[PDB]
Design a binder for this molecule. Structure first.
Ligand SMILES: CC(C)CCC[C@@H](C)[C@H]1CC[C@H]2[C@@H]3CC=C4C[C@@H](OC(=O)CCC(=O)O)CC[C@]4(C)[C@H]3CC[C@]12C
Ligand SMILES: CC(C)CCC[C@@H](C)[C@H]1CC[C@H]2[C@@H]3CC=C4C[C@@H](OC(=O)CCC(=O)O)CC[C@]4(C)[C@H]3CC[C@]12C
Ligand SMILES: CC(C)CCC[C@@H](C)[C@H]1CC[C@H]2[C@@H]3CC=C4C[C@@H](OC(=O)CCC(=O)O)CC[C@]4(C)[C@H]3CC[C@]12C
Ligand SMILES: [Ca+2]
Lengths: 932, 79, 42
């Protein structure tokens, strides 16, 4: 047989398998591994059970099913106890309309189901529907383990539930042995010898008081602890052979402790703790200590785990909490983790490296991590990670455990650097991830650390701008002496650079030891008077270091690079305009050639001295030059320097002289546009230089729409008035160039409109002609339909000069509104990349840079990493100050979360739920009075 | 009666022994009379829908279209 | 089921479910009021 009806049944024999049944439950058509199993035994006489036993199953047992997984093992027939359990499952899945569709295996015998369609003998794969001492099968159970031997299936289930109890619970097969328990609603003679075997296989029976035949016969005995038992057994059994029915009860009562009585009218909401109560008496000192709190973790029920630890003779020792946090970590369950750390663990006796290797061993097999470990058994993390909070925070980032990493960040030191560090990993490790489904969660949890790093630093910056400046430039001993700005660069942390604390910190790094509120004109006055450096103007924070704080600062290296480049373009122009005769190169032209060699020697310094890509110190030039020729400026810097080289090579050869001048005039154009890339570091200009490249998508639409209209206008005008000087350079000029200039107010009416030109007899061709006075207007044009050419100009100036130009302004004004936020956000992050690009550059500019290249190359024959230095005791005062402001920040967000309106409505509704749970006790006062 | 709270507690509780035809004609009046919230309840407790959608009952379902509709006449136009 | 959870955990549907549980409280605490009659007979 196979599945059918969408339940998954099969027929088997008694002797078959403990394991190949349960593997065929869990692997094939897998529901889950349970967190317990409540096997229910004891039939009625045929009619309906009592109302409170029905309510014990309604919202006492199946409530504990949907809360804890917890598949129920029953008969399956619609007349035994499986009817009444089947009533409860069918009730509860419509009672709570959300639900989780509780699972219940109805282990039945094959020779009882009367409407057997004999499911499809090839392989048992049918979806075959059932037609609804010959009892049927339900439609309410998720399975039906039909047994082809009501006696045969009993030795199977006790063989089954013993195997279930041997199976461990937890991801990776480690954790607790699963809890199995028999639930004994009242039965018969056979029900007493049923649960004797359960004690022999060590099953914690859970008989219910006030039930009847088999339960209350045993319930009166378990309260009869330290000749009367002759009488009381006969009270529930009018049937004979009382003697072994006496004698087997003491065989049960040899155990006496793998057995508890569900007290009548004392549970039904406490049932989930009474179930919990029976297991501890069962484990209480051999069976793999169940510890009562490790169990509540495995059930994934938080409210049990608090009240167990907050109350109930609170004497929790070390190892009681130690293995409890393992299953809180191995199974995902982050809310249990915060509870245990709130009651405090060691974390120096907890993070022993076996347990970390244990923690990484429970990674899922088909991950991008387990194989990534086995591949290794960002890429340096693989060479660093192998199988008190930082290693634990590292773990939860690696396995994409979101709320675990959000918590482990909160319990450790180094809040800002590990928030930037978490953003660094999850952007790197998403690129190292094959599939893009989980990379959406990997990138979302990177934004959540981007939120907390920006939020916590903005608190620390408004606290003390000086002491939070030291937060970035601290020598972080992680990552081989990393810096938090360097951490934010490699993370591509655009939101972290965008905040006003980091941006005001960048100006202070920009004006390095020169008091960044200094004016600009005083820097100009001190650049062109180095005597004026030591004066009443620019303030700073040995007169030789005072010299080097000025000329080593990135604004003066910038202004050195700007002054020396405006003088390059002034030398370039004075060569190009007045010193460029076909003679061999003179004084200033050779000075220009050396100047642009240094420009090229300064171009290879960025090339062989150059994370969202490779790591620092790649040392193979197929990455360093590939990342060089990827900057859009270098591409401009090399096009400039290569056609300077073309313009000089063509100049020096005698034939190609005018082509060498022509290439150098376009070469001035490209060196001057590189003036834009230099001033994008400016706060006033820079965010607007980055805008004007976002405008190119609208220029290209305009240039498309105009060019189509310029072909349309230009050929139709050149076709209507037919010039007689129709050379292809002049035809392609009156078609394109002359209409293009009409957009800019150069409208040659005298060349297109015949009524404005005289000399109307200028061609022997038939028709009437007229002479336009323009030089490239044709010798004579036609005057056939020159009403149209004049009309067709009017349509041109309307479309081009009014429709196209003013719609381009609407397109610029729109996309300036969109990209203003995002390109300023992009410029903020780009800014620090340009601050330290001048800080690492030598202090001497382009023409005099050869001094600082004959100093660097003489360094090799004799053989910017920004980090402020401070003492370790002043360094730990920083992290102590900053871990206070993390705690003052997490507790501030926790109060704002609790005092939110969405969480008062949660806490009000749960207190009305607490009212009705306790006012329902008051209702049962009527029964308390009716007995009175 | 168009009262939902009765229909849940009748079906969730009270000696729950509902058979086939007890649910079959119940969903008809849940469909013929508009009442969609009763429909979700019965499908939540499960119907056949292969023994429920017999083509007499679909023709029964279309027969309860309102007379002055743009559908009943549109059927009668197509009839 | 994801939209059904977001509908139930909405604030507009907690206020519906809170008010109906206070309505359930008063319907059941009104039973407790008629305890005075149950005591006055006693
Ligand atoms: C081709 C010509 C312009 C030859 C250059 C003549 C130079 C001797 C002098 C005349 C005035 C100088 C300028 C005076 C004002 C400054 C502002 C200065 O801006 C900054 O460095 C700080 C702004 C920031 O924070 O980014 C750049 C250099 C600059 C343009 C100087 C560049 C070189 C200039 C043009
Ligand atoms: C059909 C005819 C007109 C030939 C087409 C020529 C244009 C497509 C090209 C040639 C020169 C280009 C310009 C050369 C200088 C630049 C500066 C550039 O700004 C930057 O480079 C800033 C650097 C950065 O943001 O990364 C923006 C485009 C722009 C105006 C270009 C706009 C498009 C131009 C006109
Ligand atoms: C901006 C978008 C909408 C397209 C506009 C393209 C024109 C403005 C460009 C492309 C073709 C170019 C022309 C190709 C042919 C000539 C004729 C030429 O006149 C000569 O005979 C001198 C030497 C020669 O090229 O033969 C002068 C340059 C000119 C106007 C070129 C400069 C401007 C033109 C018309
Ligand atoms: Ca460059």
């Amino acid at each position: 047989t196979g599945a059918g009806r969408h339940s998954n049944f099969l027929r088997l024999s008694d002797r078959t398998d403990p394991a190949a049944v349960y593997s065929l439950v869990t692997r094939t058509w897998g529901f889950r591994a349970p967190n317990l199993v409540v096997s229910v035994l004891g039939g009625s006489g045929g009619p309906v059970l009592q109302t409170w036993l029905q309510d014990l199953l309604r919202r006492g047992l199946v409530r504990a099913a949907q809360s804890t997984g917890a598949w129920i093992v029953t008969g399956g027939l619609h007349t035994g106890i499986g009817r009444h359990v089947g009533v409860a499952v069918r009730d509860h899945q419509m009672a709570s309309t959300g639900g989780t569709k509780v699972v219940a295996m109805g282990v039945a015998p094959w020779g009882v189901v009367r409407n057997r369609d004999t499911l499809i003998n090839p392989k048992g794969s049918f979806p075959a529907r059932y037609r609804w001492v010959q009892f049927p099968l339900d439609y309410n159970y998720s399975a039906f383990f039909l047994v082809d031997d009501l006696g045969g299936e009993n030795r199977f289930r006790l063989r089954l539930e013993s195997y279930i109890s041997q199976q461990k619970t937890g991801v990776g097969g480690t954790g607790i042995d699963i809890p199995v328990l028999l639930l004994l609603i009242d039965g018969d003679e056979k029900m007493l010898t049923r649960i004797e075997n359960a004690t022999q296989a060590q099953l914690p029976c859970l008989l219910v008081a006030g039930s009847g035949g088999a339960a209350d016969c045993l319930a009166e005995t378990l309260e009869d602890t330290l000749g009367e038992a002759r009488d009381r057994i006969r009270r529930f059994f009018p049937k004979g052979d009382l003697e072994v029915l006496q004698a087997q009860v003491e065989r049960i009562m040899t155990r006496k402790e793998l057995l508890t009585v569900y007290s009548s009218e004392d549970g039904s909401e406490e049932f989930e703790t009474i179930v919990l109560k029976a297991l501890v008496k069962a484990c209480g000192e051999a069976s793999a200590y169940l510890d009562e709190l490790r169990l509540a973790v495995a059930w994934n029920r938080v409210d049990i785990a608090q009240s167990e630890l907050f109350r109930g003779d609170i004497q929790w020792r070390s190892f009681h909490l130690e293995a409890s946090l393992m299953d809180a970590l191995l199974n995902d369950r982050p809310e249990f983790v915060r509870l245990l750390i709130s009651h405090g663990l060691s974390l120096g006796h907890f993070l022993t490296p076996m347990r970390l290797a244990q923690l990484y061993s429970a990674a899922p097999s088909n991950s991008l991590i387990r194989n990534l470990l086995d591949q290794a058994s960002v890429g340096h993390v693989l060479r660093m990670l192998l199988g008190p909070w930082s290693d634990l925070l590292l773990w939860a980032l690696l396995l994409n455990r979101a709320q675990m990493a959000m918590y482990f960040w909160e319990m450790g030191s180094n809040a800002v650097s590990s928030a930037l560090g978490a953003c660094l990993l999850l952007r790197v490790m998403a690129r190292l991830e094959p599939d893009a489904e989980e990379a959406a969660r990997r990138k979302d949890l990177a934004f959540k650390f981007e939120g907390m790093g920006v939020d916590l630093f903005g608190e620390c910056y408004r606290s003390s701008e000086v002491r939070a400046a030291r937060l970035l430039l601290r020598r972080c001993p992680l990552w081989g002496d990393a810096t938090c700005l360097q951490l934010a660069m490699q993370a591509d942390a655009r939101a972290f650079f965008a905040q006003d604390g980091v941006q005001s910190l960048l100006t202070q790094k920009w004006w390095g030891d020169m008091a960044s509120t200094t004016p600009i004109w005083a820097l100009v006055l001190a650049f062109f008077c180095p005597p004026l450096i030591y004066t009443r103007l620019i303030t700073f924070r040995r007169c030789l270091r005072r010299w080097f704080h000025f000329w080593g600062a990135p604004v003066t290296i910038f202004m050195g690079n700007v002054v020396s480049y405006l003088l390059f373009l002034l030398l370039f122009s004075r060569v190009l305009l007045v010193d460029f005769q076909p003679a061999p190169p003179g004084s200033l032209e050779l000075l220009l050639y050396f100047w642009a060699f240094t420009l090229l020697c300064e171009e290879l310094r960025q090339g062989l001295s150059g994370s969202g890509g490779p790591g620092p110190g790649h040392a193979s030039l197929s990455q360093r030059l590939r990342l060089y020729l990827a900057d859009s400026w270098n591409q401009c810097d090399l096009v400039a320097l290569t056609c300077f080289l073309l313009g000089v090579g063509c100049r020096l050869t005698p034939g190609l002289y005018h082509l060498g001048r022509t290439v150098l005039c376009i070469d001035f154009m490209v060196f001057t546009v590189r003036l834009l890339h230099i001033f994008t570091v400016n706060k006033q200009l820079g965010p607007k230089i980055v805008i004007v490249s976002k405008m190119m998508k609208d220029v290209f639409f305009f240039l498309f729409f105009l060019g189509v209209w310029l072909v349309a206008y230009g050929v139709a005008t050149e076709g209507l008035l037919r010039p007689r000087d129709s050379d292809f350079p002049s035809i392609l000029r009156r078609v394109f160039y002359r209409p293009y200039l009409q957009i800019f107010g150069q409208i040659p009416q005298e060349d297109m409109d015949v009524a404005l030109m005289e000399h109307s007899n200028c061609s022997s061709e038939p028709g009437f002609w007229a002479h336009p006075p323009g030089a490239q207007a044709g010798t004579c044009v036609s005057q056939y339909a020159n009403w149209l050419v004049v009309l067709l100009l009017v349509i041109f100036l309307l479309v081009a000069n009014i429709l196209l130009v003013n719609l381009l302004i609407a397109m610029f004004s729109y996309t300036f509104g969109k990209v203003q936020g995002n390109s300023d956000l992009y410029w903020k992050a780009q800014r620090y990349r340009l601050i330290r690009e001048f800080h690492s550059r030598p202090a001497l500019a382009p023409p005099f840079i050869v001094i600082s290249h004959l100093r660097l190359l003489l360094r090799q024959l004799c053989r910017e990493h920004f980090r402020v230095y401070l003492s370790k005791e002043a360094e730990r005062k920083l992290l102590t100050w900053e871990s206070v402001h993390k705690e003052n920040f997490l507790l501030a967000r926790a109060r704002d979360k609790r005092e939110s309106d969405s969480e008062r409505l949660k806490r009000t509704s749960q207190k009305v739920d607490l009212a009705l749970k306790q006012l329902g006790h008051i209702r049962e006062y009527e029964q308390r009075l009716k007995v009175l």
